[PDB]
Protein backbone atom coordinates (compact mmCIF):
# COMPACT_ATOMS: atom_id res chain seq x y z
CA UNK A 1 0.00 0.00 0.00
CA UNK A 2 0.95 3.64 0.06
CA UNK A 3 3.01 3.47 3.30
CA UNK A 4 5.09 0.60 1.93
CA UNK A 5 5.54 2.45 -1.35
CA UNK A 6 6.87 5.64 0.26
CA UNK A 7 9.09 3.54 2.54
CA UNK A 8 10.63 1.73 -0.43
CA UNK A 9 10.41 4.36 -3.19
CA UNK A 10 10.43 7.72 -1.40
CA UNK A 11 13.05 10.42 -1.59
CA UNK A 12 15.06 11.43 1.45
CA UNK A 13 14.39 15.15 2.01
CA UNK A 14 16.42 15.54 5.19
CA UNK A 15 19.46 17.82 5.31
CA UNK A 16 21.34 15.09 7.20
CA UNK A 17 20.44 12.46 4.57
CA UNK A 18 19.59 10.03 7.33
CA UNK A 19 16.39 8.83 5.59
CA UNK A 20 14.32 10.13 8.53
CA UNK A 21 11.77 11.79 6.24
CA UNK A 22 10.88 10.25 2.89
CA UNK A 23 8.58 11.90 0.36
CA UNK A 24 6.62 11.09 -2.81
CA UNK A 25 4.84 13.85 -4.70
CA UNK A 26 1.37 12.48 -5.55
CA UNK A 27 -0.15 15.57 -7.17
CA UNK A 28 2.05 18.21 -8.67
CA UNK A 29 1.18 21.68 -7.45
CA UNK A 30 1.38 25.14 -8.97
CA UNK A 31 4.46 26.98 -10.19
CA UNK A 32 7.80 26.80 -8.45
CA UNK A 33 7.32 28.70 -5.20
CA UNK A 34 7.38 26.94 -1.83
CA UNK A 35 6.41 28.63 1.44
CA UNK A 36 8.90 30.59 3.47
CA UNK A 37 9.77 30.38 7.11
CA UNK A 38 7.12 32.01 9.21
CA UNK A 39 4.38 31.78 6.60
CA UNK A 40 0.91 30.78 7.68
CA UNK A 41 0.32 27.47 5.92
CA UNK A 42 -3.05 25.77 5.45
CA UNK A 43 -3.06 22.02 4.93
CA UNK A 44 -5.35 19.04 4.80
CA UNK A 45 -3.91 15.80 6.02
CA UNK A 46 -4.46 12.29 7.21
CA UNK A 47 -2.10 10.26 9.36
CA UNK A 48 -1.67 6.52 9.83
CA UNK A 49 0.38 4.42 12.20
CA UNK A 50 2.53 1.52 11.05
CA UNK A 51 -0.16 -0.86 12.37
CA UNK A 52 -2.54 0.57 9.74
CA UNK A 53 -4.67 2.65 12.14
CA UNK A 54 -5.74 6.12 11.02
CA UNK A 55 -4.91 8.39 13.95
CA UNK A 56 -5.98 11.79 12.60
CA UNK A 57 -7.59 13.57 9.67
CA UNK A 58 -8.38 17.22 9.06
CA UNK A 59 -10.83 16.24 6.32
CA UNK A 60 -12.99 14.57 8.93
CA UNK A 61 -13.11 17.91 10.83
CA UNK A 62 -14.18 19.93 7.76
CA UNK A 63 -11.45 22.51 8.38
CA UNK A 64 -7.79 22.76 7.47
CA UNK A 65 -4.90 22.59 9.88
CA UNK A 66 -3.08 25.91 10.11
CA UNK A 67 0.41 26.59 11.46
CA UNK A 68 3.39 28.89 11.00
CA UNK A 69 6.11 27.13 9.03
CA UNK A 70 9.56 26.47 10.42
CA UNK A 71 8.78 27.41 14.00
CA UNK A 72 8.52 23.96 15.67
CA UNK A 73 4.74 24.22 15.97
CA UNK A 74 4.58 20.79 14.39
CA UNK A 75 6.79 17.70 14.30
CA UNK A 76 10.11 18.11 12.54
CA UNK A 77 9.04 16.00 9.57
CA UNK A 78 6.21 18.45 8.85
CA UNK A 79 8.38 21.57 9.07
CA UNK A 80 10.83 19.89 6.68
CA UNK A 81 8.23 18.32 4.40
CA UNK A 82 5.75 21.15 4.04
CA UNK A 83 8.66 23.50 3.26
CA UNK A 84 9.26 21.44 0.09
CA UNK A 85 5.66 21.68 -1.19
CA UNK A 86 4.10 23.90 -3.83
CA UNK A 87 0.58 25.31 -3.53
CA UNK A 88 -1.91 22.62 -4.55
CA UNK A 89 0.60 19.79 -4.10
CA UNK A 90 -0.35 16.52 -2.45
CA UNK A 91 2.47 14.40 -1.05
CA UNK A 92 3.09 11.35 1.05
CA UNK A 93 5.58 11.58 3.93
CA UNK A 94 7.10 8.70 5.85
CA UNK A 95 8.43 10.00 9.18
CA UNK A 96 10.79 8.08 11.44
CA UNK A 97 10.28 8.75 15.16
CA UNK A 98 13.31 11.04 15.42
CA UNK A 99 11.40 13.45 13.15
CA UNK A 100 8.06 12.82 14.88
CA UNK A 101 7.22 11.95 18.52
CA UNK A 102 10.35 9.98 19.40
CA UNK A 103 10.41 7.71 22.40
CA UNK A 104 7.73 9.74 24.16
CA UNK A 105 4.93 9.16 21.69
CA UNK A 106 1.79 11.24 22.01
CA UNK A 107 -1.16 9.99 24.06
CA UNK A 108 -3.66 8.64 23.39
CA UNK A 109 -2.96 7.61 19.80
CA UNK A 110 0.78 7.52 18.99
CA UNK A 111 2.99 4.93 20.65
CA UNK A 112 6.64 5.20 21.56
CA UNK A 113 9.11 4.90 18.68
CA UNK A 114 6.40 5.26 16.02
CA UNK A 115 7.06 5.65 12.30
CA UNK A 116 4.22 7.73 10.87
CA UNK A 117 2.65 8.02 7.40
CA UNK A 118 0.96 11.20 6.24
CA UNK A 119 -0.88 12.34 3.17
CA UNK A 120 -0.66 16.15 3.06
CA UNK A 121 -2.25 18.68 0.71
CA UNK A 122 -0.82 22.22 0.79
CA UNK A 123 -3.90 24.40 0.31
CA UNK A 124 -2.35 27.83 0.65
CA UNK A 125 0.45 29.78 2.25
CA UNK A 126 0.71 33.45 3.09
CA UNK A 127 3.09 35.80 4.84
CA UNK A 128 1.62 37.70 7.79
C1 LIG B 1 8.52 21.00 17.61
O1 LIG B 1 8.22 19.70 18.14
C2 LIG B 1 6.88 19.44 18.19
C3 LIG B 1 5.88 20.36 17.90
C4 LIG B 1 4.53 19.99 17.97
C5 LIG B 1 4.19 18.69 18.35
O2 LIG B 1 2.89 18.26 18.44
C6 LIG B 1 1.85 19.20 18.35
C7 LIG B 1 1.62 19.49 16.86
N1 LIG B 1 1.01 18.37 16.08
C8 LIG B 1 -0.36 17.95 16.36
C9 LIG B 1 -1.24 18.32 15.17
C10 LIG B 1 -1.09 17.19 14.12
C11 LIG B 1 -0.93 17.77 12.71
C12 LIG B 1 0.45 18.38 12.57
C13 LIG B 1 1.51 17.31 12.79
C14 LIG B 1 1.40 16.80 14.21
C15 LIG B 1 1.78 17.83 15.11
O3 LIG B 1 2.92 18.27 15.01
N2 LIG B 1 0.04 16.31 14.55
S1 LIG B 1 -0.23 14.65 14.24
O4 LIG B 1 -1.08 14.47 13.00
O5 LIG B 1 1.09 13.94 14.20
C16 LIG B 1 -1.19 14.04 15.57
C17 LIG B 1 -2.55 14.07 15.43
C18 LIG B 1 -3.38 13.62 16.44
C19 LIG B 1 -2.87 13.14 17.57
N3 LIG B 1 -3.55 12.65 18.63
C20 LIG B 1 -2.74 12.24 19.60
O6 LIG B 1 -3.11 11.76 20.67
S2 LIG B 1 -1.26 12.45 19.19
C21 LIG B 1 -1.53 13.10 17.71
C22 LIG B 1 -0.69 13.53 16.76
C23 LIG B 1 5.20 17.79 18.64
C24 LIG B 1 6.53 18.15 18.56
O7 LIG B 1 7.56 17.30 18.84
C25 LIG B 1 7.09 16.03 19.27
Swiss-Prot record:
Post-translational modification, as annotated: Acetylation impairs ability to promote interaction between Akt/AKT1 and PHLPP1. Deacetylation by SIRT7 promotes interaction between Akt/AKT1 and PHLPP1, leading to suppress Akt/AKT1 activation.
Keywords: Acetylation, Chaperone, Cytoplasm, Isomerase, Nucleus, Phosphoprotein, Repeat, Rotamase, TPR repeat, Ubl conjugation
Gene Ontology cellular-component annotations: cytoplasm; cytosol; extracellular exosome; membrane; nucleoplasm
Induction record: By androgen.
Any one GO molecular function term: heat shock protein binding
Tissue expression: Widely expressed, enriched in testis compared to other tissues.
GO biological process, any: response to cocaine
Compartment(s) of residence: Cytoplasm; Nucleus
Sequence positions bearing N6-acetyllysine: 16
Result, substituting residue 16 to Q: Mimics acetylation; impaired interaction with AKT1 and PHLPP1
Entry keyword annotation includes Isomerase: yes
Start and end residues of each PPIase FKBP-type domain: 30-118
Transmembrane segments: none
Protein role: Immunophilin protein with PPIase and co-chaperone activities. Component of unligated steroid receptors heterocomplexes through interaction with heat-shock protein 90 (HSP90). Plays a role in the intracellular trafficking of heterooligomeric forms of steroid hormone receptors maintaining the complex into the cytoplasm when unliganded. Acts as a regulator of Akt/AKT1 activity by promoting the interaction between Akt/AKT1 and PHLPP1, thereby enhancing dephosphorylation and subsequent activation of Akt/AKT1.
Record text on subunit structure and interactions: Part of a heteromultimeric cytoplasmic complex with HSP90AA1, HSPA1A/HSPA1B and steroid receptors. Upon ligand binding dissociates from the complex and FKBP4 takes its place. Interacts with functionally mature heterooligomeric progesterone receptor complexes along with HSP90 and TEBP. Interacts with NR3C1. Interacts with Akt/AKT1 and PHLPP1; enhancing dephosphorylation and subsequent activation of Akt/AKT1. Interacts with IFI44L; this interaction modulates the kinase activity of IKBKB and IKBKE. Interacts with IKBKB and IKBKE.
Annotated protein name in UniProt: Peptidyl-prolyl cis-trans isomerase FKBP5
Residues of the full protein shown: 16 to 140 of 457
Amino acid sequence: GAPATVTEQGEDITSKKDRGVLKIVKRVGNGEETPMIGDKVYVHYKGKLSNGKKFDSSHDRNEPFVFSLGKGQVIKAWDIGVATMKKGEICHLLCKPEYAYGSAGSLPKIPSNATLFFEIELLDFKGE
